[PDB]
Design a protein around this ligand. Structure first.
Ligand code: ATP
Ligand code: ATP
Lengths: 146, 153, 426, 50, 428
């Protein structure tokens, strides 16, 4: 017969930790056999993505390429949503402030216009940067896709 | 069952259908499996960790109870169904048919809302020894049932 | 002015004349278009001769509503199939010349021993023009009345075709039929199919169509449109920085620069296709139409979460998923959504494409409808679309109460001389 | 959906015939229209509310 | 000249009767001798605006040509073009006016200037010559010119005319081994008697080897009965089997009729009646000894009957091995060599040594799953064992290149001329 006490004890620690941690990580195991050349460029609207779908099998074979394409386009749409909305509002200010500064640079430099342009640009840039989409890298989206 | 609500009346009917599915399978042969609860129907709220359905069958004074349960993936504790009551009930049916002959077995049927399409295939939609277990194969009405009906007639 | 006279004059002038540019500039084309727009496609009379359960019937329809009431086995759906049969020949002729329509199956003819042939007649009138269509099919060992007299229906197709051949983004009649279970072009551009038959309870396909359209609209909102927007935005600030914001040949140079920027923006906007048919206009027009149909909601949107995506509806102070709706609201949702999509794609010139012309046939409008919806569905339907005909069959008495007596018809088929015959009462 | 494609005249008699042709079969039914509701008694109706 | 003989024979046959005399006429003998002396050869081929290639002219040697290049230099394009040209000839031989493969829409060059793609080829047979052209325009363009197919039809009609008079006519071999040679152990761990099974309907690529297993079973069965005797009156026994099958059928029906026909075919053993030097046992020995040359480690290969089934048993060192338990490297060689010998042994039923026919073989990436020691001797072994065949192979490993003669190698380069990179060929 087999010996299985150690691996069951180790697996229980991972399950217990995952029970009390929101975003606990897991180890990675993979295997690329000699049958990966068949998938060289040879699903009911999948919607929910979880970290337990990569534990279906230890071997990469056949359909894993198709799910990769489905996953990739989902990331692209997520980035598009992040690219729109309120990020455009600060973008609208920033270019205009730069344009205003450029205008202040022109017309033989006209304080007054220069002071107003500098103050508005500094205030808007500082306010936009302060939020930084919560915690900067926490926004992911564009950074993961790039 | 009157009174509309968001949860949907159909869910109750198929919940009963899951419970009933285990009895016929055990009747056909001992320890035969039935319909499991798929992991994609458990509630998505973060509070829950497992789902369960239970019911009781009364036969005169006899009383049997069955519980079907399934836990979410990665849960600390695992849950299993209890089938002692159903197996015991199915044993007497199996024995009766094994000794006596021409015995009768309970009827279980379920007519969904798709019968309009299947029944409507009357237009074209284009065995000798009718046994007892032929109907003891499915619980939901289908096109092939009416096709079998014509040949039976 | 008579439409036939204008058509004759325009055709004669165009045929004799050359230099097509001048032919387009000719006032005859404008007169024909103006007369054509001032019209209302509506049927007038229908005659049935030995079709299924009915052998002789002359029915006259209204121009707003025509509800037929009765029980199972009264010819309620044969009238609709007759109108669909008549309509299909017109659609086939419109698409291509001498295109066969839909014939009559052998089993549909009456089973009486003394029957010889089955015929259907119809009369379509618009403004003052009139037309007549007759289709015949003899069973066996007889002589069907004359033949398929489709000479009149070809003139209407020619009239529409000539106008559509010269002036783009024209208007076409609407033909839709919501049947029972049974079972290049702008349509081929996005996803749509060209057919008369449509099926309800197809929520999955409409849901995926909406998702794909939203993706394409978001894709086209970026890229080149950003440049024009960016060009406008700086110019708006720059124009202010000289006159408005500045006041809480330098002047000539500034004015010339502002005028040049305005001219460049106008040239860029003019370059390229107009509003016409784009993903953004189709998406927000369909969404707005559905919001008009059900004012109990506030907004609907598609949200991409951390590990999934869905559609969110706001009702009161509760946000509900598209999958939490009951079976009752799914069918009305897809019914209005498809009706609006087909109406938008057919009238690319009207400011509000919801004022088109056509005919819609609905059978058994009470399917999976809660009685509260049944109380006001007919009121909402004729209010959102005020320039279309509706031919609807009614089964339950809940709906019939609201309808006005002017447009009600009751089937109480008597047996005249010991022979069953459908009779309509008012 | 007991009341699919039935006119009101047929809706008031379907329960009587089902309970008379097969008197020893337990029935579970979901209804939608008042015509069916009126015929049934009060001890056999369960109302679900949110 | 072949044309003169064909013209004379056609004229004589058209104005004659009594086919028996026509068969015995000197025309058939002269045509057969002339055809036999002829050797298959494909001297040149030109490619125009196909895939990356924009303009190329290639001449191929008589015995062996090797193309070497990096990744993305058009090695597979050349092989695909040759397979396309050979398809029309195969189709016309098998069935009159049978269409072949076309050129797909996306094969043409992606540039905006190119409007069409074309492949030209020339086949030299002793002194007779022929030319083939296949063309395909772009999508949405005018001047949709057509391709010429008179040469292939002229060549094919000679073959069918010769094969009509004599039922033992030989045919050329055309095969193509692609990358799809891999997967499911090549063919492992996934009757055959007609000469048209390997040819005609069967394409150029490879799908499975189960027919090799059944063919070997049939070879062994005839080997024991004919060469080793142990059958007494085999013709009488098979005829009695046919009679028994008919009696059983008289007192599922289609299967019984097929079994009766099979029994009649087996009863035709005395009808054949050759018992020559090229008997079943001689073919069995030649096939096994041929295979063993490419696998020096093994000792013997045998067919074992047990549990109502047949299995292949190999000897390595002192351990017995099955076929599923071998490695991928020895599986590739076993499959390739076995199918190569199966086609020659099956399309040349009259040669004393049937591994002496004529044909052309295309191989891509011969160095798949082979250690360098095996790579240093595969080419000379294949050349030595199949002398009268033409080989076209591609490689990118320097070990394979180091053992090839200087007159058989071709080197591909990417040279930018006038701002546009164009593929070029060269010799050392
Ligand atoms: N060939 C025929 N000859 C005579 N009667 C026919 C024939 N075909 C059909 N019928 C009659 O048609 C009747 C049903 O017609 P129909 O489909 O219009 O009914 P309905 O109840 O109005 O339909 P629906 O539920 O689709 O609205 C049947 O009662 C049958 O007697
Ligand atoms: N339609 C096309 N237009 C432009 N370039 C193309 C086109 N089709 C293919 N190519 C180019 O051809 C190059 C060579 O492809 P090819 O398949 O011939 O490579 P190979 O090295 O010969 O292959 P293998 O490894 O299978 O022997 C590719 O890198 C690709 O960029």
């Amino acid at each position: 017969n087999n010996e299985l006490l150690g691996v069951k004890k180790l697996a229980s620690i991972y399950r217990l930790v995952n029970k009390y941690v929101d975003n606990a990580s897991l180890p990675l195991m993979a295997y690329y056999s000699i049958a990966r050349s068949y998938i060289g460029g040879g699903a009911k609207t999948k919607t929910v993505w979880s970290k337990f779908d990569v534990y279906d099998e230890i071997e990469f074979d056949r359909n894993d390429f198709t799910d990769f394409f489905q996953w990739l386009v989902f990331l692209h749409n997520r980035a598009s949503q992040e690219k729109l909305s309120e990020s455009q509002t600060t973008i609208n200010a920033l270019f205009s402030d730069i344009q205003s500064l450029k205008a202040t640079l022109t017309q033989l430099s006209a304080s007054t216009v220069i002071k107003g342009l500098e103050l508005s640009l500094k205030e808007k840039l500082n306010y936009m940067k302060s939020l930084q989409s919560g915690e900067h890298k926490f926004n992911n989206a564009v950074s993961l896709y790039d | 069952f009157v009174g509309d609500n968001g949860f949907g009346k159909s869910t109750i009917l198929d919940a009963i259908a899951i419970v009933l599915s285990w009895l016929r399978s055990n009747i056909e042969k001992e320890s035969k499996p039935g319909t499991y609860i798929k992991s994609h129907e458990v509630n998505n709220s973060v509070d829950v960790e497992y789902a369960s359905i239970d019911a009781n069958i009364k036969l005169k004074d006899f009383n049997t109870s069955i519980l079907i349960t399934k836990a979410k993936e990665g849960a600390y504790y695992s849950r299993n169904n209890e089938l002692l009551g159903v197996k015991k009930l199915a044993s007497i049916y199996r024995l009766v048919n094994k000794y006596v002959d021409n015995a009768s077995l309970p009827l279980m049927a379920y007519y969904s809302i798709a019968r309009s399409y299947i029944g409507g295939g009357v237009d074209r939609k284009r065995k000798t020894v009718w046994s007892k277990f032929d109907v003891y194969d499915e619980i939901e009405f289908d096109r092939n049932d009416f096709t079998d009906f014509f040949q039976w007639l | 002015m008579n439409l036939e006279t204008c058509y004759v004059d325009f055709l004669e002038l165009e045929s004799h004349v050359i230099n097509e540019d001048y032919l387009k500039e000719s006032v005859e084309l404008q007169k024909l278009i103006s007369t054509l727009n001032e019209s209302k496609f509506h049927l007038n009379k229908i005659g049935i001769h030995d079709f299924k359960r009915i052998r002789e019937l002359q029915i006259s329809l209204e121009d707003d509503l025509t509800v037929f009431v009765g029980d199972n086995g009264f010819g309620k759906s044969t009238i609709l199939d007759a109108i669909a049969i008549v309509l299909s020949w017109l659609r086939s002729n419109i698409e291509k010349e001498s295109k066969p329509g839909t014939y009559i199956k052998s089993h549909e003819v009456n089973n009486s021993v003394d029957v010889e042939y089955a015929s259907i007649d119809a009369n379509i009138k618009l403004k003052d023009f009139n037309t007549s269509i007759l289709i015949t099919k003899a069973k066996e060992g007889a002589y069907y009345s004359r033949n398929n007299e489709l000479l009149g229906v070809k003139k209407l197709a020619s009239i529409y075709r000539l106008v559509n051949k010269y002036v783009d983004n024209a208007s076409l009649p609407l033909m839709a039929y919501y049947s029972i279970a049974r079972s290049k072009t702008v349509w081929s551009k996005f996803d749509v199919y060209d057919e008369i038959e449509f099926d309800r309870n197809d929520f999955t396909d409409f849901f995926q169509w909406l998702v794909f359209l939203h993706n394409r609209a978001s894709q086209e909102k970026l890229s080149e449109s950003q440049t024009t927007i960016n060009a406008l935005f700086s110019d708006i600030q720059s124009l202010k920085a000289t006159l408005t914001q500045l006041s809480a040949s330098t002047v000539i140079k500034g004015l010339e620069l502002s005028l040049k920027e305005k001219l460049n923006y106008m040239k860029s906007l003019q370059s390229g296709e107009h509003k016409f048919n784009n993903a953004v206009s189709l998406y927000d027009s369909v969404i707005n139409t559905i919001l008009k149909f059900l004012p109990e909601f506030q907004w609907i949107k598609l949200v991409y979460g951390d590990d999934d995506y869905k559609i969110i509806l706001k009702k009161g102070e509760v946000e509900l998923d598209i999958q939490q709706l009951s079976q009752g609201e799914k069918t009305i949702f897809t019914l209005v959504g498809d009706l609006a999509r087909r109406l938008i794609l057919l009238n690319p010139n009207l400011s509000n494409p919801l004022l088109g012309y056509g005919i819609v046939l609905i059978d058994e409008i009470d399917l999976h409808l809660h009685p509260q919806w049944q109380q006001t569905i007919i009121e909402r339907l004729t209010s959102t679309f005020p320039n279309v005909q509706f031919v609807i069959t009614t089964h339950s008495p809940q709906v019939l109460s609201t309808v006005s007596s002017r447009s009600v018809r009751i089937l109480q088929e008597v047996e005249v001389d010991g022979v069953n015959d459908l009779i309509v009462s008012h």
